[PDB]
Amino acid sequence: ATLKDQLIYNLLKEEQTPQNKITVVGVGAVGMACAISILMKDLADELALVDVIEDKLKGEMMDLQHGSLFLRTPKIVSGKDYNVTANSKLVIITAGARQQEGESRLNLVQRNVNIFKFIIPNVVKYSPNCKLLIVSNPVDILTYVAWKISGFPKNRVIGSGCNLDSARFRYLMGERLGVHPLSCHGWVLGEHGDSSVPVWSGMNVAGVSLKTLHPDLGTDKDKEQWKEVHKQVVESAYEVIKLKGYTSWAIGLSVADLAESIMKNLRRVHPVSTMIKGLYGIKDDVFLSVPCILGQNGISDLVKVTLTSEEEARLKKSADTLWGIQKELQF
Amino acid sequence: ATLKDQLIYNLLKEEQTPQNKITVVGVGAVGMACAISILMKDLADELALVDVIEDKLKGEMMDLQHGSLFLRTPKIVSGKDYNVTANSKLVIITAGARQQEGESRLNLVQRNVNIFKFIIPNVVKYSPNCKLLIVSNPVDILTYVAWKISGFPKNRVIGSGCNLDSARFRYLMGERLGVHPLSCHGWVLGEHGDSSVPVWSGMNVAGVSLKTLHPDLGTDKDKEQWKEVHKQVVESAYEVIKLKGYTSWAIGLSVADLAESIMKNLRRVHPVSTMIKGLYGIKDDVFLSVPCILGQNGISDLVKVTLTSEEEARLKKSADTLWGIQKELQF
Amino acid sequence: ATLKDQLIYNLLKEEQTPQNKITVVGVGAVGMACAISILMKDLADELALVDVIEDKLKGEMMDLQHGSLFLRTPKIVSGKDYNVTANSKLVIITAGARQQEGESRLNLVQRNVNIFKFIIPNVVKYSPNCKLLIVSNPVDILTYVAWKISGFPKNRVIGSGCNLDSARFRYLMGERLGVHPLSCHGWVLGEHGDSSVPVWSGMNVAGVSLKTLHPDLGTDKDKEQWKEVHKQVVESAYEVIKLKGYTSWAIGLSVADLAESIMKNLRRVHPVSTMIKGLYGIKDDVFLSVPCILGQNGISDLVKVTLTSEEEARLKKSADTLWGIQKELQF
Amino acid sequence: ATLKDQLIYNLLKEEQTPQNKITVVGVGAVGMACAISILMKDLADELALVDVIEDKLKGEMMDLQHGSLFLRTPKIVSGKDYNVTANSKLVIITAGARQQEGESRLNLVQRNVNIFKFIIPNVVKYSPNCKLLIVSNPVDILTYVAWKISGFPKNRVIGSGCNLDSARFRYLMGERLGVHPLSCHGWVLGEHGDSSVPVWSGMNVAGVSLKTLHPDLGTDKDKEQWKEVHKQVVESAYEVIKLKGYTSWAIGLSVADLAESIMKNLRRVHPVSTMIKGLYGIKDDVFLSVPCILGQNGISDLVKVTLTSEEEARLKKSADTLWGIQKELQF
Numbered sequence A, B, C, D: 001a002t003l004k005d006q007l008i009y010n011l012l013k014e015e016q017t018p019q020n021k022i023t024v025v026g027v028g029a030v031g032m033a034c035a036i037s038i039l040m041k042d043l044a045d046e047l048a049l050v051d052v053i054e055d056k057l058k059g060e061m062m063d064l065q066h067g068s069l070f071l072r073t074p075k076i077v078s079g080k081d082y083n084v085t086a087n088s089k090l091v092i093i094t095a096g097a098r099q100q101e102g103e104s105r106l107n108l109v110q111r112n113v114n115i116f117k118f119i120i121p122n123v124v125k126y127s128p129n130c131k132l133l134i135v136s137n138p139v140d141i142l143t144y145v146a147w148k149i150s151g152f153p154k155n156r157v158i159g160s161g162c163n164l165d166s167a168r169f170r171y172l173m174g175e176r177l178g179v180h181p182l183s184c185h186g187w188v189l190g191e192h193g194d195s196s197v198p199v200w201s202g203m204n205v206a207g208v209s210l211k212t213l214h215p216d217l218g219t220d221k222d223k224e225q226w227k228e229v230h231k232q233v234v235e236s237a238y239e240v241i242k243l244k245g246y247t248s249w250a251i252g253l254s255v256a257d258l259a260e261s262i263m264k265n266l267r268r269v270h271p272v273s274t275m276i277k278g279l280y281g282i283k284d285d286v287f288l289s290v291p292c293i294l295g296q297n298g299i300s301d302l303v304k305v306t307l308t309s310e311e312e313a314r315l316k317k318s319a320d321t322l323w324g325i326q327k328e329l330q331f
Ligand SMILES: NC(=O)C1=CN([C@@H]2O[C@H](COP(=O)(O)OP(=O)(O)OC[C@H]3O[C@@H](n4cnc5c(N)ncnc54)[C@H](O)[C@@H]3O)[C@@H](O)[C@H]2O)C=CC1
Pocket: A025, A026, A027, A028, A029, A030, A031, A050, A051, A052, A053, A094, A095, A096, A097, A098, A115, A118, A119, A135, A136, A137, A138, A139, A160, A161, A164, A165, A192, A246, A247, A251
């Protein structure tokens, strides 16, 4: 018969659902960085890609497939239709609209809502029990949107939030101190971006509180002006975009780290965006980054960080701002 | 009194020469895909990037650095000046000229020669003992060019050659047979590109020769048209390019596999481009792909594959054409 | 409020179940080598250990647990009671008597069959959908036994078989040829023991057939005496046993290689113990190694190897021997 | 000619001095667990094993070699003679004599000193520039002994010290809090074993000080008796030994973590034993664990942990006791 039949004797036809499937939505520079990082970390037995640009999507899929000999992820699929995402444990959303020349923040956000109004229901239809990880900006608002639209419980809706901000901060800290970032601990929480909060009290190496050692740490009287470190962090995306036109590698690595905790049920703690209603005097339905325990069911727990008055007020202001935009959104 | 001094006591300041450093020249889609794959495989204790476009170059470096928390490569550097590449064990070249429409092969190769006359002597100045891995196309000729300009012994100048072609072949084979590419064995040799040779006699699973089971394999009488697999291999770059505009991931993965053998001294066998004078019947100084043993000295040995009359003729034809061009090059 | 409660706000409780649980029965030298290999390969989110020596069991569990900071497997349990193994995707059996210096694995049948009569029903009780991977000796005989007792379909009952014999063969081959064993291909089939069969016709590097190059290969008139390489494979366990009293590391690695194909659904080809009825005119329900495609459903396919008349006779000899033993077993 | 020569053409006949070599001295339970952990983390291009029991040594080497197909460490060698250890970057000492019943501290140590008088000079002879990592107990004293005998600068003599104590502590903390050990930070310092010191002020999750939330942490009036955690850490070794007769896996993993930072020049911070004269009122040549920065040159820096009065006196008391023994040793 066929060469395949002469070579191989089959015992079983009945295939099986993929058991550790991940989907990435949006195959732009960010989506694809998440994809490559996920593949090279062996987190999935099946990866699906979705996008609206069909030729691009197919080309990315094929380029990855051609690398299969060097990977341990035996099936890569893609498509415009969401049936290819069926039974994903985790669905990472990087799709969205880039802010345009002259466009306001409310209109920018609405355009992204209008995109999530199509994306989310489709994801939910095919993977009703997945965790949602939102990367698209503005991430805090869009994570809220996906939670609202999906109707998922809060543990299954997760925003990339200040995960990368924190990684950047630890890299900068590491360079200043001559220590690997892995051994430099420090947390950036709150609203992702300009209004994020560097938690000076938790910055440490080997458990040694930097703020205890240098009480001026984080202030203007800070002889070393560590404030600037948080400054470089907030301005990193812009600096990199000005140099290469976009960002990709760091976000991809940082998302892959989140995926690892989730897929392997590690219960590590990560700074990610989560519904914070009921904390720091916040009573609105808003998402902000706090250290969260990540595992098989998403965010099972969050760490209640002790904040100072100034630090609590900043999150409160962020929450207020976020809510004021959200009550204007049309679903 | 500085925070760093309060926190850390320095035992010594000394030495600090990288032990496992890799340089990538050219930070386009291919260079960066090589970079990310090499990082995620923990192959290097230092990565250097070089390019002539300084904006892009700086942005790519920073983007990778921001992901340092998630990597085990503590030092990433870049610059237009080759002093950043000093003491590299392995230098990977992806830079070169893009062919114009209506431009003769000889004309293009000449432009590349002129480019390499700048790049290669600078690489050699700073890492006189490195292995050179050439990825730029046309790879076989450009590997000859690098060998000529560098003055390196044959073992230390390696062309990526048919390495990715063979990986693509194994993927396609795997797809047809329902087996992982790791367990599908097949070799594409000779001149990288449209003139490459699929060695039917060597294709096997678990040491069972497909050609033996199926004597028409690869001929025009093949009812299953396995010849189309090689045709797909040859058309892959073009098909992917047409879809996404370039290729990156598969080449990056393949290059990292080669780097792995070299850096870890594995002595695995890969199909890569090497000085083939004296073998398979060729009398000129030309590089073509054959299976090569790769390790810490680059190519220390090569495998002598038995070819059919036709297969031998095709390699001989390529050598003729390549030499016809090389002999008219101006160094 | 407790410290934990001050520090951590819980979103939801209710334990979930492991997604990728592996059980190892027998925490002896082989069981623990399997355990550490599987842990360091990140194949499981839960590892369960079972043995009849309760203090040794607890101690091995604790020793592993103490290394958790350095692993990615968040839960490790043990117990004499099989409830600790509930919900396992893969159950690896390494319990029972091992052969002493100069003793045949075949001398272990009565002891180990009697042990399997208690083990197997318990495993099936708590993980009715697992794949069974048998390691205890003699492994081909015990795979048949595990199969008969369990009532599983044979795809889900796998003996570690000649995966290790082939690994040893390829190590010895690579040493002779100066090539990494990954690049040296050659298969040892049949009994994991004295009657195993080296398949000279399939041995190759880069698709180049050593038999075609060297027609005496494997015969008695072979001036290079390659048969001695297979003889060394046969005597391997005995040599190691005489030196250090037992074998552990290589089987540990071999088992983990098998577990990776199964757990990640790779569909790689390995020589494992399975029922070969219907091949080479064999009519009995005899188990022994041939190349198999391994995935999430265990053995989905067998590769039909083309044996020479002499190879096939040697394989049928092995089968006769093994069936002579298997057929006399009383269940 | 030979099959090898018919198959393979040679370009050059090597051979390089070892580039990333590690030696393990002593192939007992701890030695081999270090070895397998190092092999599975791909830290070395060459592994050497030394012991005085020749059959045992050879057998361990062979067992490992048989697993070569599954590893990326292409050369594994062993011998009683230290010439096999030449050009090691890192030499790990696990050799020693186990303490006899009713034997004084001094006499046990002196017995290990007699062993080191032979081992260390041999190591130094063949790898004059290596880093020494001392694992044999009592580790702080034997690290001093290796330091004095070797004549090395202090940066190149490292004791595993409280590395494993700290890993256990973090495993126990993770169990109490329902969080992965990776995200549970806490440091055990000073003398390894009975007199080690838990630094309560450094224990934290996500930079949130447990001592600050819970002032009674680690005190006698602690309602949650967190001191019992440190008590478990000290009793752990004894409990495991009592159960399985020895300990191996955890120390093995902890050592490979240190080797990783050293071989890869990561500059992470580990609690390891270092020459601490000049700290905490310590004025004698003694080794005690504090957080050290580990890289290609061994310990290049250490972190100055702020200790309480009692914490300080505990270290000082250990240093007095240690020197009390050291000043009596016959070298
Ligand atoms: N949370 C964080 O820390 C960071 C977030 N980001 C965000 O990642 C997002 C995307 O990044 P880029 O890849 O550079 O943008 P991109 O525009 O290059 O790629 C976006 C992709 O979304 C796709 N898309 C648009 N509408 C879609 C729909 N209805 N269905 C499916 N696909 C659709 C587009 O076709 C496009 O391929 C941005 O919003 C960016 O802000 C970037 C860096 C950091």
